[PDB]
């Protein structure tokens, strides 16, 4: 019985798999599809799994999930639904300042019932729903920010492809002195050197990803960006040294990508395309080839840039369509159950525990070859029907 | 004279290829498609090749092949046919306890003739066919297990996606105390750390693979699993230290995948999709686009979970169809002859010899690039017809 | 302020140094002099440090220190003194069976006072001092073992240069069936492959080291042995999987070697030359060139083999002398204070905690070049006097 | 109990240490002092160890030991004694042809008794002692070789610092056509490329080492040679492909160097300095500072090149003295017992088995750091006396 004397509270666990530190040592360009998380020990049911998540230094959500500040994803209906599910939405800024402040006002005034329960409903002190908003880094964004702070916005995201700029750092120093209470997320960043300049400017969170988004062409136009899994791991590991949470933003096609982003050190995950074409996503449904579709586009797509408007405009995103997904109040419970089940197979009873296992090297990972990615999908069938829930 | 003095019973063999230990040192995600086994020396005919296989610590099969405990693969007709061919079948548990015990009873009472010959017919002491059954890890599975042990079941498989759980370890300790004679296979596991907890619980065999199965989506939903060749090699090497055989389960598309699974240290191989849509697989044939198909589905697909029905259910598998393959009594002889010719090209006269050559580093392997996998398949033709036998 | 959300109970610690696994990855021949342990965090005084140590599966000492079964180190006076200090002594077997049983009898009958205090005095259930004895693997050792078990010996060490033998495994099986209460330490071993056979034979502890001891010539005579730090790490890691403690035996010149041996996974440390030429070490003091010396010799030295006696005898050790060190009741408190201060600088409040930090990767090491070993000694002085306490 | 089914005749052995192939992969300059052989499993007594050794393609000695063709080591008294002990001696050629043929004649005419027993006495078909002789690669060496073959010499060594020459290859072709029965050892070589040219010329054995010998200065004069352990391993591995045995020549200070040389693939070991200053070594004893010494010198030392004398001669060796060792009939039994005990600790019951274990990867090695070489010698004593037997 005296095994406790020879190694204390450890006990022997066979070594198998790679720590996150080893998984990224090779300096390949790993994205979420390129690796798996190895199963752990299960000693809890999947419903016990705590999804409590830092959005910023001060704001805590009960679900890691965020709707992206895009004009085809997040206006007040999306922000209300995401808050009720225990995430948040950032109202997009491809609209007039007064329009965006009116969308924020609708979220802050919602009250519910003015039929279901929302035990994760992600409220502020006054029992109003939490709301985020995007702003740019121009001089008009100072006026927009006056209106949004008057409308009771809880958190601001500085909304750029490349947040490591004098323009953004000046905007951070301006917000943190004029509205010291206001939580500011800087971004986008993909390197620790970008993250250090915004953390030194005093941001309360970071938004991580460049390229990677489903509608994005920044990598093939600008040559610039990073494989998103590697960016999330590198920026989360840097931001963690300063107590700064990160949002893994863009490239999330599946529940398994969400679990990978959280496991690599993201505190929250931001989705455009996964929440696009829901009932709460702005714009109308339409039929093309007998499929109920809704528009979805990059904010640096030409039609997104033509709205509300150096002579030649470089596209950084595409405009397209996503098939109807139903309602956020149906889809986000599927994401929550999928995340909890993923955490349960991993043996983490909490997302804070999941990241603690990753940084301690208790959590183990495994690379996938191309043939392993084929083997991990559906293969060898004549036909099949992938109904996820 | 001098050769024996200078190096004993060795003699010089040029070094070429990698040992299994070197093949997996790189920590890539190798699956079966990612590597080849190098040819050895042939000094026997392929019909000399002994396919004798440990299923558990106590049970030996004269052939390595197992039918998977799936409701579209293994009821009594499959289990009878697989036993007569010298494998075994595990009766699925997506049915009431009395139905599954009646399927087991039909296997144990079969006798043959109540006409081919079955010199590998895989029988117990009383000359009844061997039968396996699946059970879960709930409290109803204790009653199910009582009925199955009354029906004379020879071996139990504990049937989970992630067998390293308190629920499963408790079910192992319960079976081994109440039914000490009964052989228990634990699983599914893909890591040695999972394998150690079930081997310490006292399982008699392990079932290896998570993801990998043709109908499986656990990797894209849960983020969790392993490339199956790597999982088989790692878990077989760990389980071997304790005298525990392993079943390589799922991702077997070809005879070459079976030979690879056995070469990597699997004692037996379990198939769903390769034995699905045979005459003995449960369910009816049907025609769609002029092809004779039969249903094949994951046990964690939604329509499989609906049978005999936490409000939102997460799919871990798809539902689909496989093209008709004929009869087990035709197809399993093709698998046996294919395994024997593979062993003959390798220079192993037995599967025990094959694994001994692998652990001693006598058996050599070679990685395949993507261009080598293309080169290894059919290429450069206008059209062709792949008639396998 | 929610830093706990982003990484749970870990918290950020800069990475510096190597884990023990990395320190031995290079496959150099590291001994204790070849590496340092890096300092940790101090949150306790050195006297709080708990030195409770497993000698075997069942026996616990309150100090990690053992006197070696050598005829110039351990008879009853050494064994009494080492037990009173909270270690143990193994009575040597280079004597008649009746003489060794009489030495053991003197330890078991001691009582104290028939005046310092001994709060670590390392007693049995009946409040007698613990005593070990050595035996060989011949047929006369069965009679010797009968006398020693009648004399009330608590633990047996099987005393060979190379314990992985049929002769030794047979002696283990013989002891464990005839004397099932009796604790057996196997050895000497230096590889996990040797440790496997003795652990499978059923030893309760292992003695680790071959060559390495101050009087050793086994390496330049037999070509056979291992660098002792590497042997301790590799055998302790293997033995830990089975709950078997290890004794790091030989090559301990300093307190820092003891702290290194314990950090590398040794449960206890065995000393010959460090405890030789104390007042309790057998044999007389003598003067040569004006220095008070006592004889110290290997048990495979020719004069040690000439005592109590294939015509040509191979020496495996030398015969020599050590300068007088005083008394065990003065020297072992210096070793204890040195071990506790080493643990305090490391940041481990217990030896069980120290090994837990090492296996978990929290304890970091650092290799020393030859120039770093020079820099870590006394250097650049005209003269100096190294008074240790 | 079917553990044989899962891995055949292998059985599980924990991997620990390096195979010889891995030990030399790093391309350091390992000599014998730089590595250890790890202990194996002992299932035999050391006297069972068979030391039967190929000298050439045709000649077998019962002991691996050869006296070097040096004028301070091997004339007829040494060659007789080495043959009676079950090695051989090569009579040196720093003499006139008639003198060397008379030394060979005395060995071939010896008979014994014209009283110990010599069960290893290393005779030819006619029950005469085996004798070797050296020759050079000049035209006078053709006449010398006529006389030596008339005197009944059994084996010739071609005696050069650098055997990969037109002069030596011509001499090999000349011997093999004029005396087809006569066994020829080529050398010295240290690379496989040198070995390939002499093996293609048709030598029956190789002599391996350049520098390394105790009296060597070839490395600091010529810049040319190899670390002897590495040379033995490389040349033995190459020569083994053709069934050619190797002599490891020079740098043998200890029994452990002999066991290392044999384990690295040497079939026999050649000694100068270890057999110098024995009673059978040519030259007289003399006293200097009260020590009974005998001269020992390199054959390329100036005073060795003066005997039997562009104009400037380069020393390749030193002239010196060795302390008296006694008689070959006392010392060679110590070498034999030391080799057998080293083999017993390693777990090889034969030298053919030892080399088979090394090439198959079963024999494991371990590098020594400088601090491990210190720890492996005598350390931490005031004084000591190293009596070897
Ligand atoms: N994450 C991505 O990979 C990514 C890539 C492209 C676009 N987007 C999104 O599309 C939208 C537009 O992105 P963007 O980066 O093109 O917008 P942006 O306004 O940040 O940048 C456009 C250009 O204006 C410059 N700029 C910004 N503020 C300035 C100031 N005060 N003075 C002078 N120049 C200034 C920028 O450096 C850049 O050259 C945002 O919603 C953004 O998140 C995201
Ligand atoms: N590739 C694979 O290995 C794989 C992947 C997915 C599903 N499957 C198969 O699909 C079927 C279902 O797999 P599964 O893992 O979903 O079934 P499962 O019943 O093992 O697990 C379902 C859930 O219930 C939990 N659970 C199990 N026993 C419990 C108990 N007593 N109390 C409380 N909670 C308990 C589990 O931890 C898990 O959260 C099986 O046939 C399985 O083999 C296999
Ligand atoms: N550093 C070390 O670990 C080391 C090295 C050398 C010696 N020593 C010590 O010196 C002493 C002698 O060591 P040793 O290994 O020479 O003693 P030993 O008795 O274990 O071995 C001596 C020889 O006898 C053989 N032998 C042992 N039992 C036998 C049996 N029943 N039948 C036949 N042969 C048998 C062994 O295999 C070996 O060849 C011990 O105190 C030992 O601990 C220790
Ligand atoms: N460690 C060693 O291997 C080593 C090193 C130096 C010397 N030695 C020994 O010292 C002795 C002398 O060695 P050596 O190599 O100096 O002797 P050597 O006669 O082989 O070489 C001396 C020189 O003469 C040349 N030579 C040889 N045969 C020739 C021919 N027919 N025509 C023209 N040139 C020819 C050689 O190439 C070399 O330049 C030998 O006993 C040898 O084994 C050994
Ligand atoms: O026009 C664009 N080009 C590049 N990236 C964009 C653009 N518009 C939005 N993004 C990014 O894409 C993310 C959404 O990606 P998705 O979830 O994969 O669809 C957003 O949150 C932005 O970071
Ligand atoms: O619903 C499911 N999801 C994931 N894996 C499954 C599911 N049902 C069965 N499996 C696994 O898939 C294996 C069969 O894989 P196949 O032989 O490649 O078709 C089974 O034996 C199970 O381990
Ligand atoms: O004759 C011998 N040769 C080699 N090792 C020995 C011999 N006798 C004892 N030993 C070992 O040396 C250890 C003591 O080493 P020391 O503490 O460094 O002096 C003992 O416990 C034995 O393992
Ligand atoms: O003059 C010389 N220089 C260098 N090596 C020599 C010389 N003479 C003999 N040797 C080598 O030294 C070996 C003996 O080395 P030892 O046994 O270490 O003393 C001989 O067999 C030769 O290969």
UniProtKB/Swiss-Prot annotation, chains A, B, C, D:
<dbReference type="GO" id="GO:0003677">
    <property type="term" value="F:DNA binding"/>
</dbReference>
<dbReference type="GO" id="GO:0003676">
    <property type="term" value="F:nucleic acid binding"/>
</dbReference>
<dbReference type="InterPro" id="IPR001093">
    <property type="entry name" value="IMP_DH_GMPRt"/>
</dbReference>
<comment type="subunit">
    <text>Homotetramer.</text>
</comment>
<dbReference type="GO" id="GO:0005576">
    <property type="term" value="C:extracellular region"/>
</dbReference>
<feature type="binding site" description="in other chain">
    <location>
        <position position="216"/>
    </location>
    <ligand>
        <name>K(+)</name>
    </ligand>
</feature>
<dbReference type="GO" id="GO:0003938">
    <property type="term" value="F:IMP dehydrogenase activity"/>
</dbReference>
<dbReference type="GO" id="GO:0006183">
    <property type="term" value="P:GTP biosynthetic process"/>
</dbReference>
<keyword id="KW-0225">Disease variant</keyword>
<keyword id="KW-0488">Methylation</keyword>
<feature type="binding site" description="in other chain">
    <location>
        <position position="213"/>
    </location>
    <ligand>
        <name>K(+)</name>
    </ligand>
</feature>
<dbReference type="InterPro" id="IPR005990">
    <property type="entry name" value="IMP_DH"/>
</dbReference>
<protein>
    <recommendedName>
        <fullName>Inosine-5'-monophosphate dehydrogenase 1</fullName>
        <ecNumber>1.1.1.205</ecNumber>
    </recommendedName>
</protein>
<keyword id="KW-0597">Phosphoprotein</keyword>
<dbReference type="Pfam" id="PF00478">
    <property type="entry name" value="IMPDH"/>
</dbReference>
<dbReference type="GO" id="GO:0042802">
    <property type="term" value="F:identical protein binding"/>
</dbReference>
<keyword id="KW-0332">GMP biosynthesis</keyword>
<keyword id="KW-0129">CBS domain</keyword>
<dbReference type="GO" id="GO:0005737">
    <property type="term" value="C:cytoplasm"/>
</dbReference>
<comment type="function">
    <text>Catalyzes the conversion of inosine 5'-phosphate (IMP) to xanthosine 5'-phosphate (XMP), the first committed and rate-limiting step in the de novo synthesis of guanine nucleotides, and therefore plays an important role in the regulation of cell growth. Could also have a single-stranded nucleic acid-binding activity and could play a role in RNA and/or DNA metabolism. It may also have a role in the development of malignancy and the growth progression of some tumors.</text>
</comment>
<dbReference type="InterPro" id="IPR015875">
    <property type="entry name" value="IMP_DH/GMP_Rdtase_CS"/>
</dbReference>
<dbReference type="GO" id="GO:0097294">
    <property type="term" value="P:'de novo' XMP biosynthetic process"/>
</dbReference>
<feature type="binding site">
    <location>
        <begin position="296"/>
        <end position="300"/>
    </location>
    <ligand>
        <name>IMP</name>
    </ligand>
</feature>
<keyword id="KW-0963">Cytoplasm</keyword>
<keyword id="KW-0658">Purine biosynthesis</keyword>
<feature type="modified residue" description="Omega-N-methylarginine">
    <location>
        <position position="226"/>
    </location>
</feature>
<feature type="binding site">
    <location>
        <begin position="209"/>
        <end position="211"/>
    </location>
    <ligand>
        <name>NAD(+)</name>
    </ligand>
</feature>
<dbReference type="GO" id="GO:0046651">
    <property type="term" value="P:lymphocyte proliferation"/>
</dbReference>
<dbReference type="GO" id="GO:0046872">
    <property type="term" value="F:metal ion binding"/>
</dbReference>
<feature type="modified residue" description="Omega-N-methylarginine">
    <location>
        <position position="240"/>
    </location>
</feature>
<keyword id="KW-0682">Retinitis pigmentosa</keyword>
<keyword id="KW-0694">RNA-binding</keyword>
<feature type="binding site">
    <location>
        <position position="316"/>
    </location>
    <ligand>
        <name>IMP</name>
    </ligand>
</feature>
<feature type="binding site">
    <location>
        <begin position="272"/>
        <end position="273"/>
    </location>
    <ligand>
        <name>IMP</name>
    </ligand>
</feature>
<feature type="binding site">
    <location>
        <position position="214"/>
    </location>
    <ligand>
        <name>IMP</name>
    </ligand>
</feature>
<dbReference type="GO" id="GO:0034774">
    <property type="term" value="C:secretory granule lumen"/>
</dbReference>
<comment type="similarity">
    <text>Belongs to the IMPDH/GMPR family.</text>
</comment>
<feature type="binding site">
    <location>
        <begin position="159"/>
        <end position="161"/>
    </location>
    <ligand>
        <name>NAD(+)</name>
    </ligand>
</feature>
<dbReference type="GO" id="GO:0035578">
    <property type="term" value="C:azurophil granule lumen"/>
</dbReference>
<keyword id="KW-0479">Metal-binding</keyword>
<feature type="binding site" description="in other chain">
    <location>
        <position position="211"/>
    </location>
    <ligand>
        <name>K(+)</name>
    </ligand>
</feature>
<dbReference type="GO" id="GO:0005634">
    <property type="term" value="C:nucleus"/>
</dbReference>
């Amino acid at each position: 019985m005296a095994d406790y004397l020879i190694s204390g509270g450890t006990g022997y666990v066979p070594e198998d798999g790679l720590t996150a530190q080893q998984l990224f040592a090779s300096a390949d360009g790993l994205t979420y599809n390129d690796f798996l998380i190895l199963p752990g020990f299960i000693d809890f049911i999947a419903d016990e799994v705590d999804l409590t998540s830092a959005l910023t230094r001060k704001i805590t959500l009960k679900t890691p999930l965020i709707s992206s500040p895009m004009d085809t994803v997040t206006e007040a209906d999306m922000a209300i639904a995401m808050a009720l599910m225990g995430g948040i939405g950032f109202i997009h800024h491809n609209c007039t300042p007064e329009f965006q402040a009116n969308e924020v006002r609708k979220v802050k005034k919602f009250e519910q019932g003015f039929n279901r329960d929302y035990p994760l409903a992600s409220k502020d002190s006054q029992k109003q729903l939490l709301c985020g908003a995007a702003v740019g880094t121009r001089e008009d964004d100072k006026y927009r920010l006056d209106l949004l702070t008057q409308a009771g916005v809880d958190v601001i995201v500085l909304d750029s492809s490349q947040g490591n700029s004098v323009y953004q750092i000046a905007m951070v120093h301006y917000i943190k002195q004029k509205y010291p209470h206001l939580q500011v997320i800087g971004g986008n960043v993909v390197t620790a050197a970008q993250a250090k300049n915004l953390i030194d400017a005093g941001v309360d969170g970071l938004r991580v990803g460049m390229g990677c988004g489903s509608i994005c062409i920044t990598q093939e136009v600008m040559a610039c960006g990073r494989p998103q899994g590697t960016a999330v791991y590198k920026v989360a590991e840097y931001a963690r040294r300063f107590g700064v949470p990160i949002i893994a933003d863009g490239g999330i096609q599946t529940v398994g990508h969400v679990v990978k982003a959280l496991a690599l050190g993201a505190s929250t995950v931001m989705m455009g395309s996964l929440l696009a074409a829901t009932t709460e996503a702005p714009g109308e449904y339409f039929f093309s080839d007998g499929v109920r579709l809704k528009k979805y586009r990059g904010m640096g797509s030409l039609d997104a840039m033509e709205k509300s408007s150096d002579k030649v405009k470089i596209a950084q995103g595409v405009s397209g369509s996503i098939q109807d997904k139903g309602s956020i109040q149906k889809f986000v419970p599927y994401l929550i159950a999928g995340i909890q089940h993923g955490c349960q197979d991993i043996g983490a009873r909490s997302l804070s525990v999941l990241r603690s296992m990753m940084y301690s090297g208790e959590l183990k990972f495994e690379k996938r070859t191309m043939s392993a990615q084929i083997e991990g999908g559906v293969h060898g069938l004549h036909s099949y029907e992938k109904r996820l829930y």
